[PDB]
Write an enzyme that holds these catalytic residues in place. Structure first.
Site, PDB file in Angstrom:
ATOM      1  N   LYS A   1      46.619   3.440  17.159  1.00  0.00           N
ATOM      2  CA  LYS A   1      45.296   3.558  16.937  1.00  0.00           C
ATOM      3  C   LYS A   1      44.680   3.025  15.760  1.00  0.00           C
ATOM      4  O   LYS A   1      45.365   3.116  14.706  1.00  0.00           O
ATOM      5  CB  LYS A   1      44.745   5.063  17.002  1.00  0.00           C
TER       6      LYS A   1
ATOM      7  N   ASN B   1      50.092  12.852  21.743  1.00  0.00           N
ATOM      8  CA  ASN B   1      48.564  13.504  21.555  1.00  0.00           C
ATOM      9  C   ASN B   1      48.459  14.719  22.611  1.00  0.00           C
ATOM     10  O   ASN B   1      47.751  15.472  22.195  1.00  0.00           O
ATOM     11  CB  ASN B   1      47.565  12.856  21.984  1.00  0.00           C
TER      12      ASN B   1
ATOM     13  N   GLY C   1      45.835   5.492  29.861  1.00  0.00           N
ATOM     14  CA  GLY C   1      44.334   5.832  29.761  1.00  0.00           C
ATOM     15  C   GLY C   1      43.524   5.898  31.101  1.00  0.00           C
ATOM     16  O   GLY C   1      44.234   6.331  32.024  1.00  0.00           O
TER      17      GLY C   1
ATOM     18  N   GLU D   1      47.416   6.395  39.894  1.00  0.00           N
ATOM     19  CA  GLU D   1      46.661   7.588  39.612  1.00  0.00           C
ATOM     20  C   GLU D   1      45.322   8.079  40.109  1.00  0.00           C
ATOM     21  O   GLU D   1      44.809   9.040  40.573  1.00  0.00           O
ATOM     22  CB  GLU D   1      46.299   7.823  38.275  1.00  0.00           C
TER      23      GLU D   1
ATOM     24  N   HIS E   1      41.751  13.412  20.075  1.00  0.00           N
ATOM     25  CA  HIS E   1      41.240  12.092  19.732  1.00  0.00           C
ATOM     26  C   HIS E   1      41.009  11.995  18.190  1.00  0.00           C
ATOM     27  O   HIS E   1      41.216  11.445  17.491  1.00  0.00           O
ATOM     28  CB  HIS E   1      40.576  11.414  20.560  1.00  0.00           C
TER      29      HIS E   1
END
Ligand SMILES: [Zn+2]
Length: 337
Positions: A98, A18, A173, A203, A63
Site C-alpha cells: 500500500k 489485514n 479485491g 467470487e 484499511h
C-alpha cells in the site's frame, strides 16, 4: 476430534494479513486512532467486540489502521504467531502493498515493514528467508482497482524480494471492480519471471472473466464459487488447485450452504483443494475450525483428514527443499494419527 484437529500440522495458503488481525489488537489500535480524532471509536467498538454488514465495517476500519509501518510490522508478527500456535507448519501470507506518499510509505517500505515483522517473531521459530516452527512465504496481492502500471510495480517489487521469501503474486479485491485485461499483462510478466500465481476467481458470476483466468493457467485459484460446468471441466483438466474458504464463502453468501459447497465435488473427483481461512480474524474462525467444518461435512476419518492436509504440500509455492522438509514433518507427525 477438535483437540486432534488442532494438533494436526496444517498448511495455510489463502490468508490475508489485514484480515487475520486479532480482535484485541484491533480494539487497541482503533482506540488510539479515535483518541487522535482520526475516527469515532463508538462506531467500531461494538462490532470489533458477525453479519455481512459488520464484516464490511471491519474491513473499512482496518484499511485505516494499516497506514503506518509499525502497525504492519506488528500485525505481521501477531499473525505468524497465531497461525503457528494452532500448528500451521507452512503459511503463505498474502497482502496488498500500500502506498501513502503522506506517511512516507511506498509499496517497498510497506513490504519492508512486513519483513521486519517476520524478523521480530520470538514466540515461535520461523523460517522465511530461503517451540513450534513455521515456514512463512509471502504473496504480494494486486488489488482489482489498480492500474496495469501499479500492478507492475507490485510485480517488480516481488521479484526484488525473492531473497526474503516472496514466492508469488495474487489478484484480489472487490470482484465487481476492474477488468481482467488490466491485470493480465502484469500477471503474465510475473509468470514469465517464474513467480507463482494465484487468482481470486469466480467470487461473483462472470463467465467471460472466469474463462480468461482459467486460460491464463495460474498455479492456484481461490474460491471458484460461481463456476459453470464448462469452467469445472477446464479447471479439472488443467489441474489447478483450489483454495477453499468455507466460512468466508458461507458468511459472504457466495455459497448458500456447506452441504452444496463444491469442495465436496472436488474432493470426490480427486481434484486438489486446500482448506484456507481467508480472513480468520474478520470471520471469527481459524484453520483448525475450517478443518472441523470440512471433516464433519464430508464425514472424513482421521486418516483421510491427515492425507488431505498433507496433500497441500505439492500446491505450495515453496522451493523443493522446503517441500521435502514439509514431507518430513508430516511423515514424522503421522504416528499420532
Ligand atoms: Zn481472499
Amino acid at each position: 476430534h477438535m483437540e486432534w484437529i488442532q494438533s494436526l500440522p496444517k498448511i495455510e495458503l489463502h490468508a490475508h494479513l489485514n484480515g487475520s488481525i486479532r480482535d484485541s489488537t484491533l480494539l487497541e489500535l482503533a482506540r488510539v486512532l479515535g483518541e487522535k480524532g482520526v475516527i469515532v471509536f463508538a462506531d467500531v467498538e461494538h462490532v470489533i467486540q458477525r453479519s455481512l454488514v459488520e464484516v464490511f465495517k471491519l474491513f473499512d476500519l482496518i484499511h485505516k489502521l494499516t497506514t503506518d509501518h509499525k502497525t504492519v510490522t506488528r500485525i505481521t508478527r501477531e499473525v505468524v504467531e497465531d497461525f503457528a500456535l494452532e500448528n500451521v507448519v507452512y503459511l503463505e501470507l498474502r497482502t496488498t502493498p500500500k502506498r501513502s506518499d503522506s506517511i512516507g510509505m511506498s509499496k517497498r517500505s510497506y513490504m519492508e515493514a512486513v519483513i521486519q515483522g517476520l524478523r521480530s517473531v520470538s514466540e515461535v521459530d520461523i523460517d522465511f528467508v530461503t517451540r513450534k516452527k513455521i515456514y512463512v512465504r509471502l504473496l504480494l496481492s494486486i488489488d482489482r482497482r489498480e492500474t496495469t502500471e501499479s500492478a507492475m510495480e507490485t510485480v517488480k517489487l516481488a521479484l526484488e524480494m525473492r531473497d526474503v521469501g516472496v514466492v508469488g503474486i495474487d489478484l484480489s479485491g472487490n470482484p465487481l471492480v476492474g477488468e481482467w485485461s488490466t491485470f493480465l499483462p502484469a500477471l503474465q510478466y510475473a509468470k514469465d519471471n517464474d513467480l507463482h500465481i494465484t487468482l481470486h476467481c469466480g467470487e461473483v458470476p462472470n463467465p467471460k472473466e472466469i474463462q480468461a483466468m482459467l486460460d491464463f493457467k495460474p498455479h492456484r485459484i481461490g474460491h471458484a464459487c460461481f463456476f459453470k460446468d464448462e469452467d469445472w471441466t477446464k479447471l479439472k483438466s488443467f489441474r489447478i488447485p483450489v483454495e477453499i474458504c468455507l466460512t468466508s464463502n458461507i458468511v459472504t453468501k457466495s455459497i448458500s450452504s456447506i452441504d452444496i459447497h463444491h469442495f465436496a465435488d472436488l474432493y470426490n473427483a480427486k481434484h486438489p483443494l486446500i482448506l484456507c481461512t481467508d480472513d480468520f480474524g474478520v470471520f471469527s474462525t481459524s484453520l483448525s475450525n475450517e478443518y472441523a467444518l470440512a471433516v464433519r461435512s464430508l464425514g472424513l476419518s482421521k486418516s483421510e483428514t491427515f492425507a488431505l492436509a498433507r496433500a497441500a504440500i505439492d500446491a505450495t509455492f515453496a522451493e523443493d527443499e522446503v517441500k521435502q522438509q514439509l514431507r518430513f514433518i508430516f511423515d514424522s507427525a503421522s504416528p499420532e494419527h
